[PDB]
Structures are given as C-alpha cells and as structure tokens.
C-alpha cells in the first residue's frame, strides 16, 4: 500500500521563511511560525487565513498547541517564549530566563507544563499558569534542537548538535537515558512515537532513525532525503498507513513505510528547503512549509 498525497491548497502571507507548522489537537487549525516574527492561524480543511498573532521582537523558530487547542506557545530569537490565547490573540505570558535564542517548545499532555530548548545548551520546564521557570536542565554541551514530552508527560526527550539524545524524568529532572551512536553526528530533531515506546531522531548526515527507548537499540533507518544543514521536523503518520514523514533540503516531502523503510512517496512543489511537516490528528492530511525562496505552506490530502 502506498499513499497518494496531492496538493489541495497553498497558503501565502508570511513575509520571510516559515519555520514551523502544527495542527491543533482538535484538527480545526494549522498554526505557522516564521522568521518575520509572526504566528498565523489558518483553517486546516479549507486553507482559509484566520488571523495573525504578533508581539515577539525577533523571529520565531517553533510553535506548539495546548491539548485543549486554546493556547499556543512560541519560541523566539528574542530569548523568550510567549504563551498566547488563540481566540483573542493576546500574549498571556512571557517566559524569560534563557540566555540565547530559544529554538523549540512543546506542551505536556496535561498542558500545565511547557518544555523549551535553547542555543544556551539548556532545557527549561515552565509553569503555564504562572509563567515561572520550574527547572533548568544542563541538558547538552551544544545547542538544543528538539524537545518533546511522551504520551503521559512523565518523560522528556531532547536532542542536540552535541550528537546526543537524552531521556529525562520530568518530575525530577534527572537523566534516565542517553542515546549515543557511532561517530556522533549532530542530532537535528527528536520526538516520541504516539505510543511513547519509540523515538524518531534526525541526524545531519541525511539520516532518520527509529530507536526503541527501553532497549537503547536502533530498529529502523530511513534515507534518500537530503538533511545536512537544517533542523527539519519529522513525523509519525498514523491516521491511515503507518508512515514516516519528513522535509528535505531538496525541496521535497519524503514519505517512507515505517516497517519496510522504503520511500513510498515524494511530494513535489516547494521551491526551497522544506523545513517543517505536520500530520493531521484524524485525517490523512500533511502540512509542509519552506524557507526564504518559497515562504508558503502547502496542504496535501491522501486516501490512505
């Protein structure tokens, strides 16, 4: 079985490169962050622009939804994160304390906590209600490229240019595991599988790997794409067939079979590096976004 993703919409309106796109957990919305210091909200199913959210003093590298789809968090080069009410567009909180560009962010499932990773080689855990920083993990010896909570929020996975993935106990901040592999290539992205048993990690040697968290063993490898310079988002697609979805520096969206590792589709149409992909929580829908020479988001639909 192979998917047949086809272009449904292109979304234009960011004035610089787009950095991240995410579907709202309720499937209604796509949120995009960009170098032009803006977040934009679009309808997931019709591509209609809904609103712009602004207030960061520099560009935004990541954005994430709360579980109830009511809040957003953004990570910015102005060294802060911001918590936003989506319906009103107002900034509810500004999370300060990182000493460098903030690069990645995510809510936990309960959405009382936010995790962030920064160029200051640190991971921080923040309280949503008060905006205070609860914990600072001396997580890495290089910039932190990704942070992600597991299914129930008891664990944090982080990745860094230092070549390490680290599993942390959220409650204690103690490191439970470190994944190392061979020649220590920079790790550009990491995230838990939906079941929380596996970890998908991108390295800047044109490689994706599926690791079993419990065993510390790499189970699958995915290649054929170009990934050497940027921290590209990758995804588990679970609404139809079980795919791995990633962007690529050859302007293509790559889709692999999870079990067999064969490339099952390449989505063509972007005119720059595809920095971010996102998979719709209930429909076979992919959102992709590209850098300076493109500046657009594309929505793709498939039957499986």
């Amino acid at each position: 079985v192979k998917p047949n993703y086809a272009l449904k919409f292109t979304l234009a309106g960011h004035t610089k490169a787009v950095s991240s796109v995410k579907f709202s957990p309720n499937g209604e919305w796509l949120a995009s962050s960009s170098a032009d210091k803006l977040i934009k909200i679009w309808g997931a199913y019709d591509g209609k622009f809904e609103k712009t959210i602004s207030g960061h003093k520099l560009g935004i590298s990541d954005v994430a939804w709360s579980s109830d789809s009511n809040l957003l968090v953004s990570a910015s080069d102005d060294k802060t994160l911001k918590i936003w009410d989506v319906s009103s567009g107002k900034c509810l909180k500004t999370l300060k304390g990182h000493s460098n560009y903030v690069f990645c962010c995510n809510f936990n499932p309960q959405s009382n906590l936010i995790v962030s990773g920064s160029f200051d080689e640190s991971v921080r855990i923040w309280d949503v209600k008060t905006g205070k920083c609860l914990k600072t993990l001396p997580a890495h010896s290089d910039p932190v490229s990704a942070v992600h909570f597991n299914r129930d929020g008891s664990l944090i996975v982080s990745s860094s240019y230092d070549g390490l993935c680290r599993i942390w106990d959220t409650a204690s901040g103690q490191c439970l595991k470190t994944l190392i592999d061979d020649d220590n290539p920079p790790v550009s992205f990491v995230k838990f599988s939906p079941n929380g048993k596996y970890i998908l990690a991108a390295t800047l040697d044109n490689t994706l790997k599926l690791w079993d968290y419990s065993k510390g063993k790499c189970l699958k490898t995915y290649t054929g794409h170009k990934n050497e310079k940027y921290c590209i988002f990758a995804n588990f697609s679970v609404t139809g067939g079980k795919w791995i979805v990633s962007g690529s520096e050859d302007n293509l969206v790559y889709i692999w079979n999870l079990q067999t590792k064969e490339i099952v589709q390449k989505l063509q149409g972007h005119t720059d590096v595809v920095i971010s992909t996102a998979c719709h929580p209930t429909e076979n829908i992919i959102a992709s976004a590209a850098l300076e020479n493109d500046k657009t988001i594309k929505l793709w639909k498939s039957d499986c």
Partner: peptide, 6 residues
C-alpha cells in the same frame, strides 16, 4: 534561528 543553516 531554525531558518538559517548551521
């Protein structure tokens, strides 16, 4: 700056 190469 995710939009800039390393």
């Amino acid at each position: 700056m995710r939009v800039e190469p390393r």
